[PDB]
């Protein structure tokens, strides 16, 4: 990991890069022949928004996403993991991955409403006043459609709109 | 045995009175304008009981105030027992005032019309003149039908009351009924003159309710005069606390007093 350090000493700005030690991959993956990290660790169709230990491996400390060219995931898993990270952040997981704002934490607001499996943004969805009748009903989407391929032990399909 | 007096606070509220509406009088201002004042006489104002804030509302305490004296021979057993325990004769009208916990007064305390000083805004609550079961034209002000252009038995009918497709009338439909005998409140009534000897308050504008009726007077709750109680006596007016007799009539800075030099413009 690289860190940028700025030093101010008498109208002089010193910008330096510092390299720190970084953790490495575990020695024994279950499927070493797999090119993709998730696809070789056999976590494909296994992870979800609840699995925070996997989603937290590759994210910026401020909650930002990480580039695929650096991560190495396949496109579908990259999109699915991006959706899962967004869902976890909206649900309230990863509490330590928010920017530190000393000024903004004093003026408290309304308590955060508990939520999970949230698909859209909380500030962009207008309430459905019509709600539709039985034949034509405006169903409420829950969860991301990219996670419809996960393993279903019960075998019942995951209701993405309710 | 007075209760401790707390200092005035910006978020505090004061207790009101229960007066009697005498009548209406004119009053001229130093600028030549003429206003109409109503005389409210505080005959017998006494604090009857005190209810805790938690046991009444959870935000503000409640103080009970009684009106003018009535006869013992026409009141109920429980009311007579309550007044016997209190030590005071029964009152006619009994009202509840929402006051802050720092302005509480011991029950049995009398109150005087000097509680309001010349120049203040008060709210007046009373039962208006009850006109009984009146027609729709007098009640809601609906226009009537033409008088003589052939209209038959319709000069004051309300007319249509709903629509055809609805097949019913909405609950908010305006219809003839009882009119007048309801409690109404007038806000922002300015007080000009305070007569101490007779306990008379001169309130600007009309007062809801007929003459010789009980009127509940309180401070103005309007945001324009939310913090006008700073200069007023916070707990109440104590005639014994100052040990000084107030003048017979306290006037406002603009009221043309009866003894005047007959002001002329320049």
């Amino acid at each position: 990991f690289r860190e940028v350090v700025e030093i101010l000493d008498g109208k002089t700005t010193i910008i330096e890069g510092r390299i720190t030690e970084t953790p490495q991959e575990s020695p024994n993956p279950p499927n070493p022949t797999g090119q993709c990290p998730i696809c070789r660790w056999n976590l494909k169709h296994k992870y979800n928004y609840e699995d925070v230990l996997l989603l937290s491996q590759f994210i910026r400390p401020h909650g930002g996403m990480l580039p695929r060219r650096i991560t190495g995931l396949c496109q579908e898993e990259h999109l699915k993991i991006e959706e899962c990270v967004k869902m976890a952040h909206r649900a309230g997981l990863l509490p330590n991955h928010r920017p530190k704002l000393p000024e903004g934490f004093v003026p408290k607001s309304k308590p955060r409403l508990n939520r999970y499996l949230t698909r859209w943004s909380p500030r962009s969805v207008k309430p459905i006043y019509n709600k539709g009748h039985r034949w034509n009903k405006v169903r409420m989407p829950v969860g991301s459609p990219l996670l419809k391929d996960n393993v279903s032990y019960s075998g019942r399909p995951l209701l993405l709109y309710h | 045995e007075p209760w401790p007096i707390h200092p005035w606070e910006p978020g505090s509220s004061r207790v009101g009175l229960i007066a009697l509406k005498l009548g209406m009088m004119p009053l001229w201002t130093k600028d030549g304008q003429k206003h109409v004042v109503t005389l409210l006489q505080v005959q017998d104002c006494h604090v009857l009981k005190y209810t805790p804030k938690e046991n009444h509302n959870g935000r503000m305490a409640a103080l009970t105030v009684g009106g003018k004296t009535v006869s013992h021979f026409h009141k109920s057993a429980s009311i007579l027992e309550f007044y016997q325990e209190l030590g005071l004769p029964p009152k006619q009208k009994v009202k509840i005032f929402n006051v802050t916990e720092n302005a509480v007064i011991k029950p049995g305390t009398p109150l005087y019309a000097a509680h309001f000083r010349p120049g203040q805004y008060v709210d007046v609550t009373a039962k208006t003149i009850g006109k009984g079961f009146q027609g729709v034209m007098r009640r809601w002000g609906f226009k009537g039908q033409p008088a003589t252009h052939g209209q038959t038995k319709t000069h004051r009918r309300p007319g249509a009351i709903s629509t055809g497709d609805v097949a019913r009338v909405w609950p908010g439909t305006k219809m003839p009924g009882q009119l007048g005998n309801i409690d109404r409140t007038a806000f922002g009534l300015k007080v000009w003159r305070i007569n101490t000897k007779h306990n008379i308050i001169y309130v600007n504008g009309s007062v809801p309710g007929h003459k010789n009726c009980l009127v509940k007077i309180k401070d103005s709750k309007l945001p324009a005069y939310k913090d006008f109680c700073k200069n007023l006596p916070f707990p109440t007016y104590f005639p014994d606390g100052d040990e000084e007799a107030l003048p017979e009539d306290l006037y406002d800075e603009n009221v043309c007093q009866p003894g005047a030099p007959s002001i002329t413009f320049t």
């Binding site: 022949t33 090119q35 993709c36 696809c39 070789r40 396949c74 | -």
Partner: protein
């Protein structure tokens, strides 16, 4: 009674809708995704 060819998509009978749903195309799905495969 409508004509054989119409503009309003000529909503089908329930049995025909069931037949269409049953006969919908099913693409062949391999066991292992070949993108990240060796």
């Amino acid at each position: 009674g409508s004509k054989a060819v119409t503009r309003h998509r000529r909503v089908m009978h329930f049995e025909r809708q069931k037949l269409m749903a049953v006969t919908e195309y099913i693409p062949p799905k391999p066991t292992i995704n070949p993108r990240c495969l060796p």
